[model samples]
Target: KSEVAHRFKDLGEENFKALVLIAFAQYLQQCPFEDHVKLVNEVTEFAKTCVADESAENCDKSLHTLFGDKLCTVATLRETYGEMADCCAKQEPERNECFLQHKDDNPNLPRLVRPEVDVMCTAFHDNEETFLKKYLYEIARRHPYFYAPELLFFAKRYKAAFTECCQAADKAACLLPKLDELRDEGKASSAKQRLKCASLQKFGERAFKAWAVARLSQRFPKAEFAEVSKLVTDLTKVHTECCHGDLLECADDRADLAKYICENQDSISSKLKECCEKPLLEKSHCIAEVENDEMPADLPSLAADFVESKDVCKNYAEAKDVFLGMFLYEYARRHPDYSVVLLLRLAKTYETTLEKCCAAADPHECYAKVFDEFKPLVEEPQNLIKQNCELFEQLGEYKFQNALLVRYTKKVPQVSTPTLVEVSRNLGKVGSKCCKHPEAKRMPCAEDYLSVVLNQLCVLHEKTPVSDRVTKCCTESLVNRRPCFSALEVDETYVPKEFNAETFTFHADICTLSEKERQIKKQTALVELVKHKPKATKEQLKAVMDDFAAFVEKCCKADDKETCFAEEGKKLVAASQAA
Candidate 1:
């Protein structure tokens, strides 16, 4: 007996069969027509064998065939689908609906890694038919929650790409792009499913359901409120389950809605009317793309009794989703211009602020500071651009870039040298392009380039762990992120390597260059000195720089310049050592 069989025994005979059948039914719904009867018969035979003898060998094979190769342990299922046991207790369609509606995967659960194109293509070229079967099975097992139809669709697409690309001289080049295209399409589709569920989650299911009913009623004015409400309720159930990343239930639930809309085409929005005529998959995509109607004019206005003023902790403790969700729903509908990105930011800020304030001695006083904090969201990006450009103009190109390197190295001393150098060069690119532009045009140039560099930093830091200050700053909403990064504290834990005073030595040809070049050389020397001795106090470094300046002054004008440098450089090096 397998783990699945063991779990079946633990659940008792009656609940065991009930749970398996529920999961099996949802699985069958997404399978293609030809395999439906065959799969059903196999499941029945397995169930009969398992019932007669719980340790039956076929029970393991049957369970494996019905689910994917990876049969999640009972313990895993309990946490991932905590409601499954109770849902099995219910009778008929309610049980089926409950099983279908719960999204299966948890974000924290590690997903299977996808094979690289070269590896996949190698398998495909070796044996077309067998490889395709293996491909489908592997994908199905990896993404167990993915609908059979979706996996079939991906397999078909994969075979088509491989078959065509195999004939090409540059097979990898031809096949590589198509691989990510197919992969990304699946992820994008899943993202839509997640977004719907996220919105449902963020708005609280009750408020979201209510909001949907109101909006759908507006779109389909001729439909009865009671009928529209029922449709909303049904779909909301689907959203709840599919949000777990169960594409099969998501697809089945959506396809089922086709009957209602297609039957009453005239009553629905024009876009949805177009959607209902398409094939099941395309129709689902079309329906998903349908633009939302305007918010209902008569929906109740949000009360001024802010979340903080209420029994903030009490209401949240009762139902976190509904409390936060109501706030999100009300806040979202009232502000049409707010993107999901912005609204999510607001929700996060709200939750964090409340969590802190709720624990305070005077929650009211703590809550009062909340609004002031978020104002920087809009202003920070523009302020960041302004500050960067102003400094770029003041410091000139080389000095500005060097300054960035020095400051950032001190701020994030633990950062890898290669990463620091890479980031510094990118930051310098912005100054080079923007600082040279006319004053009126400089702002936008800086804005555009700075965003690209900062975005790269965020992406780079995500893959590799960096300092706490940088990581926390990157976590801030993108709009407010610029200021957070700009405000990063110098690392207190950092101790500079042993000081190198040779960096302060002056060359006789320095005075031959233009005054600007001379000034830059002096600054460059100082920057190198600090890089070698970052632990030195600013006053100490400044005194050393002063001594170098005096050395340069005397040595550059002296008739025997090399002799002057030889004599004065020693004193300058000693001064640097003393500092």
Candidate 2:
């Protein structure tokens, strides 16, 4: 027996070199067929070294040399060698034969012999085809170079594929209508992807219509874009249908589109006049232009002529007046300075204008308009009056005192009678106005008013020579209003023994102390007299003793009595003597 076959004897036939060579060849076939054949031939020559006399370990060594060598870069071949040993052990002859055939074929062929191979090959091919298709689609979609021109083409292909998928009648085929229904339902979805491409375009209906008008203008700059007439009639019909249909649908986009088209009156009007009867075009042109901001330049003069024309159309006159009103309002808003007094005067001149103008007007808004118009000129004069009035009042009292001082000669060194009188008069006016304004009534508080007055007085005193007396008098009066008195005690017994002594005695005997002092004295007397008395019993003698003692003490210290007592006593005594 050969050394190669001998090598397998200890290892058993399962580890035979033939099996390993076959497996290696099977694995090689996974490469390109030409490389696969070369790999198989190399494995076969190495397998011959495994003879019967050789140890089974030699076959293992030979197999390793063929497929597991560092020179062999094929991983599949190494894997197959292990698989072949397992197969031989399991006695799977068909598996063994499948590998052997590949080895025998110098020109490698990819095939499926066993049931496992058949199933795997089919799955692999199907997966590969699907993968390639998906990959190509993705590349075209993502790469700009491929996507730009190929987008439409891809769209068509996708649509066709979807259609075919829909008709195939497979499990996925039934999903086609569902997908279509989903897409339809998605139109109502808030998902951004569901929006239409056309609606997403930057050129809105108004912009498109504007462009159209511009094109028409380019064609005939001298004539109105809409005056061409022909295009207008067609546009009108389309517009009416669109307005009635899409506009009625109440979609925001549709309404926006309609408003845009209507705003392009020139284009529509010119087109209409060109295509339709002159009368109909004439009727529509004025209405459309009025709807937009395209009213005729001669509209004001035309309105005047209509009012004067004996054969004027009643509708034409009314429409012209309405147009004029709108134009005037627009003009007023744009040129507010000139129109401020103008509008106000116009409102007063025309009863209709006044009633209509201010009827729905905002008061603050109109006030702002008036304020803006005349505020600059009026403000300077008003501010000067305010400043003059303030200065006059400030100097008025000082001036009056100065005149008085001059009259006295010793009181003050200077005076101006006329200036003083004028200042006083103006101060009176300013004071009167301050008292009258509602803002005066709403002044922060009495303290705030006092603060302002005091500050003014201080300033005047600092500025004027004789201001010290005036400021002092004013400050005294202010203080008197908020009086603060210190504690004082008077003896009631300091009554004079003068005319009608009885009345004087009673008046003087009464305590004139503050309530706090009186309370302290009463409390002291009560405590001294009652502290030792029985808790439940009243001590009448003690109370009487304390009262008598207090009276005697008051009479003994008569010198400390208030002056009112002495004066009252003298009055009473004099009256008694006269009687």
Candidate 3:
């Protein structure tokens, strides 16, 4: 502690402690799977240095974290978690079987070991030409299901170094044993991951169709073997064709798959043979194998899914506001024969579903699981939409419609009448190309409206007279010369809770209308009321007439009173004369 005194001699105790927490992180990477993700995130968090970002000024935290608290970290972990520690003690067969079932029961219980395969191809065919030996061993050691051919991955390149490993009467036996024995064996395996094809065509796909071991096993079961007479003339061709073959890059999903597809293209009979000949269990396994190669894991933006086919929905689900919009667009694309109203109905259904469970655990998978739930409704297009109108509508909170309304509250806030008007107006629009929008092309139409903006009509408009007049205008403009198509009606305009009476006037509404506008509305309405109801008794007139007098006093006191009454006298006299 004394030897390097100058290095931190002047640093404060608190600052020194923070730095120490950062240093301790790099020392603790061996934490097992129980909290592997949790642990990884926390340790890296404390170690996170500031972006050449803004200085250490205080900030309101809605979403950023310098990650988590300093004390919450791997260094603080007392010992390996019980599940991980216990599983690590078991031998291979039981451990793997136990871990698989463990994952089945507890999908996320930490594993004592890692996946036995580059399951995500996160590293394996990572669009790269090579892999680190250490990276391979660590990943393969941890994975739940490493495949057999994965062992001789690089030997396929038929490099002179691996030429010998490729020999032996049974290359699988000869080389597979050596994979575990060597310290730097990753240097040996390459180019074996390209197993992608269309989901609809699962049977014929195989990245390793030409793999020597399987071919040799099927051909020569009796290991009388390739004991070198022609130094095994029969085996040499199999080795060179697969090992030094042009197929090396074929495992690279993006590149060699094209030429490999051209070369390996087979007849429908071959696919039928592959699928029908395998035992039923193997058939399903083969189907899952093909799916792994082609299914998209995630889309970059919400809109990316729209142009994609129905297959995009196969495993794609995201718990995001944008996903709804994109999904609606995709639904419109897929159901050219359906109407937008019904599409809107389905969107609302799935949207409300995600909203209810969005905050729950595993929200992403929750969305993915529910994505399948939509099929039962829409698959029967013949009579589905005719009977399904408003069937999925959320009447109580109108969850789907309300989700859109809430989105605008965050985005547009409608804190001013002008912005509020624009939001309410734009929430739906002027034009309709197709709304019963059965026409696949009705998307950008003038009358084509959004459920959100229409739902804005549901928000009780700004209750004040001036604001209320515009709400009617906005609502009416949407469906002129026809029955009002307003889909939403609410109790009234909003007041954010962030404001309190001390700081804000309860009567002011969003725009804070001037006192003049306030009185102007009262005076105008009173004139119209008096003129139209000349026959009413004075009692009927008393309530409105007195209310106006008080409003003028409070709101228009700046003006001369004599002038106000003289103007009002005109309307009252006209009403009385007419009656």
Candidate 4:
């Protein structure tokens, strides 16, 4: 043993001394100066006595003090001594067979110096085959002097452990494609299971990387630094691709990937600095810059052109305004000033500019842009305008009724009755006359009379007692009636000019009613000149009222009754309901 130590003096002093102490301790505990059986029994008794000591703390402290810091605890001391004892005790052929059998069955028994030393010892024992095959052999080949003759044994153990871990990681990776496929198949539960498997693979990869780093460090110390660094970088890229990369084809994954890369950048930078020569550091940084900052090369040329286009000044302005509003809103919260109002005004101006530009291109497109850009704010104001307009139209119907009442009174001063019999008669006469005209052949002409009658009827329909009577009379008079004016001749021009069929439909009903009301007033004025009093008596009035009531009952009861009325009447009815 002394000669062996002298031959390997080039090995570090600390390792050399540790080896010597281990040998000396083993000889003291289990030398075969006594009979072979007696020596075996003595060592066994000593081991049992030590294990039987109830206080593990006392055993640990004593062993630690005896062995010093380099190799402390009962486990370390026992392993050293036990190895020597086994050599001497198993010298006989029969005893050696027994020893081999015992070792095979209880491989961890030699290292089990303390009850607490279970986890690592069990791991080594259970995966001994993998540790020997995959890792240990490589270590022995690389650093023969590190363990001398023991290197071969260590290498075998290491290989076994490494191979087992690698196999587990590979299994985990294999499940990832299956998981992705399941995701596509729309099996959420199965996909999740696959993801879990992939996650396990990631954990295995991390552990394997750590093991590889540690193992390689013991072998090729200098080259291991660079190799481990590169391995870490490669593993990180793989992890990012698996976890953070976008599943969608259209989505930009670079931003998310860049964010992750940035988060781990310091660690990567440190590793690069440690692993690479000074010259290589610049090259690594350049590579990282391209990945972290540069846009993907595979992106379409058209997309790139749009992104870089100088012609997109309008778009840029619009985007700037949007961002400006956001900034101003935030700024206003912290800093109160008259400038906030100015900023709000500016925001509105920018909004108008965007609207104009979009409208010039396409009105519908402009509206869509408004919704996309300032959605909640712009939509709210437009909705308010619509509501106000509806309310105004509703109020206008009542106003029209009051105006008609005034005009009717002026025409027939003696007819103080609330029943608008004369007014209805005059309306019918005007409608009949317009219907007779060749120019009133179009739908708008009919729509005009229909509007006024409908508006008046709508007002009356909503009124408790009058509503039923009004509906009855209007329905009878208007249904299947020809136009009183030409709808095509009526101004088709819109207010905002961006009006479509829907807007036209809505407003045309109101316009028709207005035109009819004007004509009715003019006709009523002419009739009042000669006949100052209503020609009908109470019976005639009742008869007209009854006829009108019956007519409304039959005509207005149908679903299309509203459509038969003049456009104004329809507008009034719609406005009233909407309000």
Candidate 5:
């Protein structure tokens, strides 16, 4: 038994029965499935045995044996009945019926409004699992008819939206709109399902089956048709059951569909194949980014997808915004490389253009030229990668990494040393991979991998404190992000304090180190010098490092090495200070 189920013993028999019945009633209200009458008859028979005088002591246990956690999940028994102490103070069936009548309300359940922006973000940061449970419970209760799998799917999307929005510099600005978008999706839930049902009724299951096959084939173009059809059939079953309100069957079928897709990795697109290799929760989430196995050789044109059909406006009008929403999903899935900010902008632009052009006398002519505006919007990010690759090769790895370290430190001097070092090190690895190509093919290889460096900088500092400029730069759409960081101004207000050399004395045991250890110690000594003397210029610091290396070399080989270091170390600090 779950700990939650065990806690029900404290509810006392009378209150427990009332709570269970109320919870079941709440579930029944939203459940408009075809077999509802049969389910109720079964529940009514169970309720008789559950509410009997002889079985009072075993009621909570029997409820658990039959329903498991389902009853516990539909209502918080402890909290709800605490508020209903007076109601339970009444008689048996009367008290049970009291809650059943009021099951339409959240008064029995606590108010679950949207949380403050910072509160939600902070709670998620503190403990993700706990917050996600609360999110799922809150969303699940609101749509009581939804089965477990569908509720989990909705919660996953909510979590993804929250994560993506929280990474932005202005969490409120990013998250509030996303919440509104999710709310809009919530409102349209049944409408979309009903539309699916109507689509099945009018167009026939064969049409949707054919569409699913074509869709999966396009994404996994290299896969065999035999394998693709099996994948399609499973997906087709999820809609077939779900639209008819056989949600229990739908949930099981959808789960099987996920399992089939995950297990048959050979039939999936290359990108989706990677997703299937992940763990369970991540496997489903990652596969959501499916696209054509091969996008166009030259960046794919949106014109055909965006504005090809003559009845585009008519279709948009008839479908009740579902058409455009599907368009957004189609476009997004196709270009998984695009950022959420850019894609949201595209959706916004498409909607606004549609609203304006569809009102015009010549909607087709006005819409035909619309995609031209988006061409540059897409290409700018691509060009940024090319420009970075060219610069990476021109500067060489050592110089390029040095430049990155200098620029990042200068831009955000408050950044911690470990974070700075890690970001620079990862970016250096990108340069090592991309910049080593022979001259003819160098830029192409470099361009392909350059986004790795920029995206690393964007995400690596999510928990680390950084400058406002760096945060804003990272928060920009990917198309504009590179230029934002590239053009950011250095912090001019920071000043380095002077250092003392009292802790800088060397031990004679330095002579005992092997060549590799000695080389490493020299680098450590240089770092110590830099930390102590922050006011020292890089060249001035290098001069001190060189002086210390020569002192170590001469002192270690001397007849009186201990005495030599004791005397020379003082002069070394003095020379460093003088420089």
Candidate 6:
């Protein structure tokens, strides 16, 4: 060993010593007298006693101390070790098998010490410009040897050239698909360049998986980062898988992101709310906890569903339990800014009154008495709104967003009344689309979600030839109705302005109308209108909704009845308002 050391002396004291320590770690029992047997035995004995053998982490500590953190848990140390270990093998196949077994066991482990790849994929997809800029330093960090500095001189030049040529084109394509172009140049200079490019691609793919998990960790904090991933993960996951390639992946990723932003933005708002609630010092933790969490299911298909003041309108006395008000009152109780002391008492009042009146013979009269008793509070919800408007906005927005999701989740959602999430989503959509400053601060009395979701007040009433046509177009291009409505309302001309009868059937009844059907449709619309517009007087408005009924009677017989109504149905809506 001394003679070998003397021969290796010029190689450097550090590397030789490193190899000596390695031999000690691997060497077995004693052999001949001058075979370094005693030295080996003592070393093996000490090795068995070393605390580093306890855990993988403990085993890695020596490496960390030797090479520092960058190489300690990185691909470089492991990869360099593999090449060195391969040279020691009696047979080459054994080395191949060892690495193969490793990949089989740790399927996502990267071959090159390039975690930069993993992180870059997420960074690129989420915030591409920042990552592309950061990637400039990526390869320089991978040089791994006593003489690795020699390569760094070339690595910099090579990366500078590679970046200039490869970044603008189909990036993966520029590097990967060039192998065929170099195939015929086997042993030629192009082969070397081709090999580098091919290796780059494998490094990139493995890095993608690595970065994905790391990004996920960043995206989910309370969640085990082991799986804190995000949307199609909705929108992006399915789209990315279905579409291949960087160009397509990027296109799909961006498109889906926009869809999520425009059509499915309740989640972004929800996440922002979480971030907003968290203190800045603790915001990073909140980001990891919530960013990648599946948002509460997107809001449901919303409708106004507002019943006319519950008075001019009627339903089963039992069906009219005060639960909706009771439900809204739950949210009100937690609300800050205002004292819910009175709201709680009112909830108690409603609950108690409902219990008394729910099974009573004169349930309506009983309900009226309770309403009379709570009249001051009802008339002055603004008092609650005035003090707690901000809190009201926060929770009200959350509740409205939550209400939208409540439909699919089948959970009891909160509100000022037992409001439908379906109703809130539309009204929410309407306000977002058509209202100006439609916030609890600006319009507290009519600003609750119930008032604006599918808001008749959405300021979207177009009296043009295609005004009603805009509403139908919303349910298209937009999957959830509210965004669809909001999207088209903002779409200046409703550009792709053709109608699908098949589509319209989902939200409206433009199909052939029998007398009974017409009557039922008119009655249902009246009921919904009354439910929504309680203040609208029933006595003055009742004409069996004649003009609209007659228009429906005439319009139902046209060959293109939907178009008939679209062209002439303006009169029907006007006729209802007149009555």
Q: Give the candidate number with the greatest lDDT.
A: 1
Q: Who is ahead in lDDT, 4 or 5?
A: 5
Q: lDDT of all the models against the reference?
A: 0.56, 0.32, 0.32, 0.32, 0.54, 0.33
The candidate with the higher TM-score, 3 or 6, is 3
Deviation in Å, model 6, residue 23 alpha carbon: 58
Off by over 4 Å in 6: 1-379, 382-447, 450-509, 513-540, 550-579
Rank the models by lDDT, top first.
1, 5, 6, 3, 2, 4
List the candidate 5 regions with Cα displacement exceeding 4 Å: 1-258, 262-292, 295-301, 304-384, 387-399, 434-466, 474-483, 496-579
Candidate 4 or 3, higher lDDT: 3
Model 4 vs truth, CA RMSD: 38.5
Error of 4 at 112 (Å): 26
Q: What tens digits encode model 4's per-residue C-alpha lDDT throughout 30-144?
A: 2222222233333334334445553433333322122222112122236455552443443334432232222211012232122222333354458654323223222212221
- Please give the distance, in angstroms, between residue 58's alpha carbon in candidate 2 and its true position after superposition: 88
Candidate 2 structure lDDT: 0.32
lDDT of 5 by residue, 495-543 (tens): 5424555445567888897663464455445444444444435546556
88-185 in candidate 1: lDDT tens per residue? 45544454445445433222234446577667768788878557654554444334344433444466678899999878888778987897788756
What total of clashing residue pairs does each candidate reach? 5, 36, 26, 35, 0, 24
Candidate 5 residue pairs that clash: none
RMSD of 6: 29.1
TM-score for every candidate vs. truth? Answer: 0.40, 0.13, 0.20, 0.13, 0.41, 0.17
What is the lDDT for 477 in model 3?
Answer: 30
Model 3's alpha-carbon lDDT is 0.32
TM-score of 5: 0.41
